[PDB]
Each structure stands twice: as C-alpha cells, then as structure tokens.
Amino acid sequence: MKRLVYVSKILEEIQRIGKVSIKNNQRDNITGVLLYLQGLFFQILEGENEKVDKLYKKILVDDRHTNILCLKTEYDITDRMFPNWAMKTINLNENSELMIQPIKSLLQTVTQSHRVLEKYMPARVIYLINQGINPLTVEPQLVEKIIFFSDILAFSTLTEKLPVNEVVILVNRYFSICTRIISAYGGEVTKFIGDCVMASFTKEQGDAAIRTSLDIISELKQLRHHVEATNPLHLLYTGIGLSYGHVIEGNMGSSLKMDHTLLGDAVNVAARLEALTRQLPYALAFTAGVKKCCQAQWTFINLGAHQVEAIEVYTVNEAQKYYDTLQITQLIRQTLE
Amino acid sequence: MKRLVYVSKISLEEIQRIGKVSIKNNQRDNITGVLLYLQGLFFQILEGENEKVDKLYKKILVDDRHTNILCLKTEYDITDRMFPNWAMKTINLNENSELMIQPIKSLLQTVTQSHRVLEKYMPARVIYLINQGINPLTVEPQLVEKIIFFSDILAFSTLTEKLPVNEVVILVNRYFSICTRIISAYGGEVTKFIGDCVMASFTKEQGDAAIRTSLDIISELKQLRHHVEATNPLHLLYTGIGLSYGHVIEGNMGSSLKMDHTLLGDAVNVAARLEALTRQLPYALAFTAGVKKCCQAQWTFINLGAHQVEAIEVYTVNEAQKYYDTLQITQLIRQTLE
Ligand SMILES: Cc1cc2nc3c(=O)[nH]c(=O)nc-3n(C[C@H](O)[C@H](O)[C@H](O)COP(=O)(O)O)c2cc1C
C-alpha cells in the first residue's frame, strides 16, 4: 500500500474527468481526492502500488494538464487517508465559505511561488522529490558517474565585445540546447558555472554521453548557418570534456544554503579535458574510463597522454573539427570590431 | 494601501496571545489580516495603509518567536481589503478535526513543506527578490561591478581519498555552514557551491567586508581545528581564498527547463585562480589591485608581485599569513590518515 501526491497546471470537461476517475479507481481499488484552484490541480492517489503507478502514467500522458510534479510519496501506510472516495473532485473556486477564503489564498500563493522555485532546482533534487524523498535527509553516496563539462569557445572575447543583452541571449540559447539534449539522453545537469555546463551520466550511459556531446556540437553547427552573420549565435562553438570516476553525490551545505553537488577528482579531470579541446582537432575529449562505459562500436582515436598521474586521452572520429580552433577566436574577434 | 504575505518557522497557549495582542495592536494601527498556524509554520496576511503595516512588518521580522521568515507576495495599492472585518483572525489548522477541510489542509501542508525545502536551494539573490516582491524570472540581467569571492578546502582531494564518505560529508557541510554564515553576516551573497568551492560576491562598497569575511573564515577554521580531537577530520580543515573585482553580468540564465542565477565575466576566473595561488604562498588570502581599491579601512597591504593567469598584480594583508607552511600540511594531512 502506497500513496503519491502531485501538483500540475491545466468546467464541464472537469466533471467528465471526475466521473471517469471514480469508476476506474473504483475498479482499480484506489481512492483519492482531486482539487482544482485557479488553473492548478492537486491530486492524491493511494492504494496497492500496482496501478497507483499505471494510473499515474496515464495521468502523465494526458494532454490537458501539464508541468506535472509529484510532491510526495508514501509506502507501507497502515491506513488509507480517503477510504470511501474513489475520487472526490473538489472545485475550490466556487467554495466561497468565508473561513475558507484565507486558506485558498495561502494555498494559491505558496503553490505559484513553489512552481517558480522549481525552475531553479537541480534536476536531481526534483527527481528525489518525485520519489517521495526529503533531499535534506538523503545521505550522500559514493557513486561511479560519468562527469560532463562544456563551455562556450572564446567566451571571454564574446563577453568583451557583445552588448550585455546579446550575451544573455547567446548563453540562454546555449544552456537551452545543452539542457534539452542532456536531459533527453538520460543525463542530469548539475549546474551552470559561468558559461560552463556541468552534468553527469551513470556508468551504463557511456554511449548516451558521447551522443549527447555530438548532438550539442551538431545543433550549434546548424544554428550557426541558420542565422545571419549579424547574429551572435553565428559565433557560438563549444568544447566538451568527459571523465569517469567515483564521486560523492548529494545534498550539502547548511540550513542557510544547500546545493546538490558532486565531489571528486573526476569532476576536475573533466573540466580540464574540456579546456584541452581548445588545442585539439576535436571538440570532444574523454578518458579511458568513459571509453569503457560504452557499448556502441565507436571508432576511438587515441589522443595521447596528457598530465593533469598522466592520463591517456581519447576521442571519436565524429568529433573532428571542420574548422581551425584558434582561427575562430581570431574570427570572433575581427567580426565584433 | 498594501498587502503582503509571508511564512515563518516557529522557534499552544502563547500562540493565542500573539493572537490577542495583534488582534489589539493591529486595528488601532488600522490593519486587517489572518494568521494561520500549521505544524510549526506560520502564514500571515496583514492589510492596511502603507506606512503602518511596514513598521509592523519590521517589529515582526525581529520578533523572537519565529524565524526563517520569507515574504512571498507583496501587493501594492490594493483597491479593497480581503478581510475587512478581521483586525487579525487567528486560525490553528492542526486542531481542525473536521475531515472535510482535511484534504486542503493536507495539500497546504505538503506544498509549503516542499516550498521551504526548495528555498534552501535557491540563489540568495532570488530569495532576496521574492522578499522584495519582484518576480525573479522577469528581472533582466544587469552588468554590474562586483568583488568575486572564491574559497575552497586545502588538499581536499587528499581528504576525499583517505576519509570515508560520511566523514568527508561532515567536513564539507561544516565548511559550507561556516562560509555561508560569515559571507551572509557581512552582506555578501553566496552564488553557488562547486565541488568543495564556495563562490560568492560583494558589491564595490564592500571591500573591507570581503576582506573581513575572508579573515573570519580563516579564523574560524583555526579555532575548529584545536577545539576538536585529533581523530576528528575537522582537525585537518584548511582553506585558501581568492578575491577579484570586475564587471560581471548577474542575471537569470537558462531555459524554461532549468534556470540559474549566475555571474559571467573574467573576474570569476581571476578569483578562482588567485585562490589556487594561495597554496603556493605564505598567505591564505590573495586578491587583486581592484579589490584593494574598493577598501577604505587602513589595512597593511602586502604586494606579492605579478602573476600570469596578461599578468596580475597580487596583494594580501598581513593578518592572512600562514602560521604553517603549505606542502607539509598536505603531507601531514596524509600521514595522519593511517
Ligand atoms: C506569527 C506572529 C504574528 C504576529 N502578528 C502581529 C500582528 O499582526 N500585529 C502586531 O501588532 N503584532 C504581531 N506579532 C508580534 C507582536 O506585535 C510583538 O509581541 C510585539 O513586540 C508587541 O508590540 P509592543 O512591544 O509594541 O507591545 C506577531 C508575532 C508572531 C510570532
């Protein structure tokens, strides 16, 4: 016996939604409550985990509501909380009971506020919250991750020369492209550090980490020729570093400020392979360890030993640079002056 | 007139005296509102003419029986009042046995409980903004002059290699706890943690603050080391600190998918590098000419010559001298860990 609680973003159709959920939840044996307030849903679903989930999956696929977040989960509950309500839909906008108006006010406010904060949250925290887990309570673990670093090439020159607002548009589009792909491929972005994107994949995701990289590179290449030469995006290039090692993962800091962080040498090895791509005919570089997390039959190029005790460095064929790198930063420089 | 809304964490019978005196001090100041108590948390709405409910809001910020106050919403120049008949209506939901409101009491308690956890992950700047009533996601980034602060643990990769996981965590949490406390005490903002590094910034008028922050960090780690026993890893906790001063863009960046608050500019790289430099120097603080120009206090500045990172003149203050040498600390750190 389990129970989840989620919030999402969305009159007669609502009634239809409700009638159908009572009959199926009556069949499935799970009971719950559903609340609607000013474009916001809340829903609790409790029972045998079997189709708590399967019901949930159907809810996720449905097109009406959107931006679904599972706020909490609970396993092994001695009791149910709503034992006789297959689904009790509560439209709260027309409940104008006086001593209830204050609570609707607070619920709306903290919720909308909540949904803003959700945008700043590291994706591993948001994940933990789905699984019903207090990220403040999880003990950090030591895990073998693939670590991903990428930044924008010659970013000090674009900053030196573009107006501030062009610089934002450029970074924003870089982070947008980087996040979507990394996320699509199973990865998790840890944070932005300046222009740099940091992320990590599991050890079963070697192939996805290379594909991710290759997709970033490729998407920025397409953007460069889709825009006009007056567009700064025309100048956006990246380099990508990947390492593989053990890292303490988890939530750290104090009650005053927390962060989700990875600690370990491999983080720094990845940063410096990223920085090394500036001197190489490839925009992606990575270690023997990443090489071993891969199942696809890549064509691996030994780039040689680089110190950072020395570490052998590898890339794949598909990452060859069709350009000369330090020529580009001379390109960027001329262009912007 | 105005309307504001906040949560706080508490720090039965005196709950309702807060009721009593607000219910009595408020209306004479001509304000209305509601006070909700739920599981150690307070939510309040306070509505009146603008100058009066500000003076009340501040007498409340410093009121000693709650803490972790966040003002969520701030409405200006309201047309009417939400609770015109309530000088201040107190409501304690813990004791609303009625199951009928229990679904919405259960969803209010879940959400805010979540909210207060997400708060602890936010950039301090966006918590600042929410308290000022500005929506953080619609502030356009500005190019501003800041002092950039970086600090990190000395020989941390040797710690990570010889301590067990839980001990490293204890060590890192304590170091962040201290850093964040003092940076925030002095008016800086932590911008993020990166591995073991603390990254913060101060305004141009906070140069002495940025130095004193740095010396206070260093001083606290020094007391901790001798306060604890030799089997306690905190006994081996050291830091180095780098300060730069430069133009940086400070704004919300990312995509609807992920957003961050951050700073772009060379000053960031300059300060991280200066910090990496302190390992090579007799001093645990290092900073640039520009930082130094932001200081008004009469410090004894010490010039450590130029350093390529074009070259950078580097300064410290005498108070920052290490009573140790820095390569032994590395080998001492290593030997102690059997
Ligand atoms: C959660 C909470 C809400 C409060 N709300 C009010 C309020 O609405 N109005 C008010 O005058 N005081 C409020 N107070 C605190 C009192 O004003 C405080 O005791 C104050 O020192 C009394 O004012 P006085 O010293 O001028 O007599 C609140 C305190 C708490 C903890």
Indicate the topology.
Two copies of one chain form a homodimer.
Chain A lengths: L1 E8 L2 H17 L2 E7 L2 E8 L1 H13 L4 E10 L12 E4 L9 H17 L5 H8 L10 E12 L2 H7 L2 H21 L3 E6 L2 E7 L3 H21 L11 E17 L2 E7 L1 H12 L7 E4 H4 L8 E7 L4 E6 L8 H11 L2
Helix pairs in contact in A: 6-7
The complex binds flavin mononucleotide.
Structure characterization notes:
By secondary structure, chain A is an alpha+beta fold. Chain A folds into two domains: 1-138, no CATH class; 139-337, no CATH class. The first copy, chain A, has ten helices and 13 strands. The first copy, chain A, has helices at 12-28, 49-61, 101-117, 123-130, 155-161, 164-184, 206-226, 265-276, 288-291, 325-335; strands at 2-9, 31-37, 40-47, 66-75, 88-91, 141-152, 188-193, 196-202, 238-254, 257-263, 284-287, 300-306, 311-316. In chain A, a hairpin with a 2-residue loop joins β9 and β10 (257-263). In chain A, α6 (164-184) packs antiparallel against α7 (206-226). Chain A is elongated, with a radius of gyration of 24 Å. The interface between A and B is large, with 82 and 80 residues. Flavin mononucleotide is lined by residues 18, 21-22, 25-26, 35, 42, 44, 46, 56, 59-60, 63, 65-66, 88 of chain B.
